[PDB]
Design a protein around this ligand. Structure first.
Ligand SMILES: Cc1cc(OCC(=O)O)cc(C)c1Cc1ccc(O)c(C(C)C)c1
Length: 263
């Protein structure tokens, strides 16, 4: 009984309004359809072979060498992963209504954040791998040695901790939306449309969490601190990406990878 829940409680936990449920369903299918979901075609997905990613040897300024071969294997699969993120965003109405200029900024802004989340939630405890591009299951050491350095460690620990959050497609979808609709970027026009779009998404997202009634204490603040986890991952990665670019030939960076991550 809703009225009793309402009286008895300390504060109120509103569930999604119809307008928000529409927002949630569009977001949920946006993410599902650009997730390399669990469909037929993606669930053909092999571990990265154990002899790859064990030979880090190209020196990076912070001392954490890079396995050239493992690196190449990851750049070889990264373009579709970046593209899927673009498709995700394009399928959100509040995104596509935005000036093209704003859209690029927003995607550059959050691409790694969304990719990292996407891997994070694909963390698998019995194998101790993340799944990259819906396809490649990799271990902590492999991804670490293959380019990402301590950014691998961060995604793994994020993925490990998210295990018990039992996120469903929606929660990951709305997390992405919150990440995407961020005004922590320079050079946007619709700084206010974007803030309002993030508010609506946060509002629908908490309201949805309310609906799910996870049996973790303080789920929503916790699920909010994960967002800053992700921004920190994105920021470490932007930094290691510049050092990736200093140390390695452009031949190894796929045009799109270069594009999403150049300043
Ligand atoms: C390759 C890759 C794919 C990926 O897929 C996310 C998804 O499922 O869409 C998610 C992550 C986190 C990575 C890893 C990655 C992410 C950024 C980056 O600069 C590098 C270089 C070492 C090639 C690797």
């Amino acid at each position: 009984s809703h009225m009793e829940e309402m009286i008895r409680s300390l504060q109120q936990r509103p569930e999604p309004t119809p307008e928000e449920w529409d927002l949630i369903h569009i977001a949920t299918e946006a993410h599902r359809s650009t997730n390399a979901q669990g469909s037929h075609w993606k669930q053909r997905r092999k571990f990265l072979p154990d002899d790859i990613g064990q030979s880090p040897i190209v020196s990076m300024p912070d001392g954490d060498k890079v396995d050239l071969e493992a690196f190449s294997e990851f750049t070889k699969i990264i373009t579709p992963a970046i593209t899927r993120v673009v498709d995700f965003a394009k399928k959100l109405p509040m995104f596509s209504e935005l000036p093209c200029e704003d859209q690029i900024i927003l995607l550059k802004g959050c691409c790694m954040e969304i990719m990292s989340l996407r891997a994070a939630v694909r963390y698998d405890p019995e194998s101790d791998t993340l799944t990259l591009s819906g396809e490649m299951a990799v271990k902590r050491e492999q991804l670490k040695n293959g380019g990402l350095g301590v950014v691998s460690d961060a995604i793994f620990e994020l993925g490990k901790s998210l295990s018990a959050f039992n996120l469903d497609d929606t929660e990951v979808a709305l997390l992405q939306a919150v990440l995407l609709m961020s005004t922590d970027r320079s050079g946007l026009l619709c700084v206010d449309k974007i803030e309002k779009s993030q508010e609506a998404y946060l509002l629908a997202f908490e309201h949805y969490v309310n609906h799910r009634k996870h049996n973790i204490p303080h789920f929503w603040p916790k699920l909010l601190m994960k967002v800053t986890d992700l921004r920190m991952i994105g920021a470490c990665h932007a930094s290691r990406f510049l050092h990736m670019k200093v140390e390695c030939p452009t031949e190894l960076f796929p045009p799109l990878f270069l594009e999403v991550f150049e300043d």
